[PDB]
Amino acid sequence: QVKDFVIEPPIKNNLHIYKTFGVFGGKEYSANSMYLVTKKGVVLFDVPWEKVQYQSLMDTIKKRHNLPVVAVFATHSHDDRAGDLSFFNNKGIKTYATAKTNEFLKKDGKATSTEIIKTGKPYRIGGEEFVVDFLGEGHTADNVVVWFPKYNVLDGGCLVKSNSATDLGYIKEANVEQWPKTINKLKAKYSKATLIIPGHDEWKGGGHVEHTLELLNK
Ligand SMILES: [Zn+2]
Ligand SMILES: [Zn+2]
Numbered sequence: 001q002v003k004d005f006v007i008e009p010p011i012k013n014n015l016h017i018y019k020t021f022g023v024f025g026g027k028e029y030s031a032n033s034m035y036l037v038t039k040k041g042v043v044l045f046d047v048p049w050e051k052v053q054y055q056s057l058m059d060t061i062k063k064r065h066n067l068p069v070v071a072v073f074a075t076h077s078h079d080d081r082a083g084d085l086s087f088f089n090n091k092g093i094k095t096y097a098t099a100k101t102n103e104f105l106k107k108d109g110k111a112t113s114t115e116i117i118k119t120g121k122p123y124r125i126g127g128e129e130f131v132v133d134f135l136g137e138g139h140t141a142d143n144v145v146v147w148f149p150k151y152n153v154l155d156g157g158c159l160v161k162s163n164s165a166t167d168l169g170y171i172k173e174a175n176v177e178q179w180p181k182t183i184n185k186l187k188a189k190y191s192k193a194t195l196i197i198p199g200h201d202e203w204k205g206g207g208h209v210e211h212t213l214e215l216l217n218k
Pocket of ligand 2: 031158199200
């Protein structure tokens with residue numbers, strides 16, 4: 001498979017945004033994920049959209065950083081997020097999801113995580129720190145965000161729409177009534193965030209939170 005994924009220039013050395021692509025309904029779409037380099041290996045936040053690219057990403061990370069992937073955190077149950085966790089489980093790489101996300105994975109016939117996320121509590125690995133937060137339902141009932149306090153970056157995931165999105169996208173499993181309330185909680189909580197990464201489309205340019213509220217109103 002062609003290496004068409006994009007690893008962006010990192011925030012303060014170790015925090016990386018990476019973009020992967022998938023074709024759905026005759027059109028190519030982008031998903032933004034992240035990874036964090038630590039002294040004990042690399043932590044993925046969500047996985048390539050296409051499972052055929054899992055090994056490719058791991059190989060690229062090994063060549064770039066001389067480090068293995070040592071943990072995978074899913075920000076919800078969908079294919080562009082948790083994906084197929086069996087790939088990582090089979091290799092003995094710890095995978096992390098909330099109880100809710102695991103319930104969805106199991107219901108959908110998919111592999112579940114080997115570790116259970118405690119929301120709102122610091123995770124520390126290889127000298128790095130982050131917090132996985134559940135702010136409420138939105139894009140899905142299980143969507144969570146990831147705060148990186150040393151980087152002032154919030155991984156919004158698919159709860160946050162891109163400034164470049166023209167609709168809400170896949171909403172069959174969304175809680176549209178709760179979504180703006182969850183976004184307003186996010187907006188109030190992460191004032192220190194100088195960068196918020198939306199799950200899909202353009203991550204550059206800011207104004208993602210405000211545009212999410214606009215799309216919800218429309
Ligand atoms: Zn989703
Ligand atoms: Zn998504």
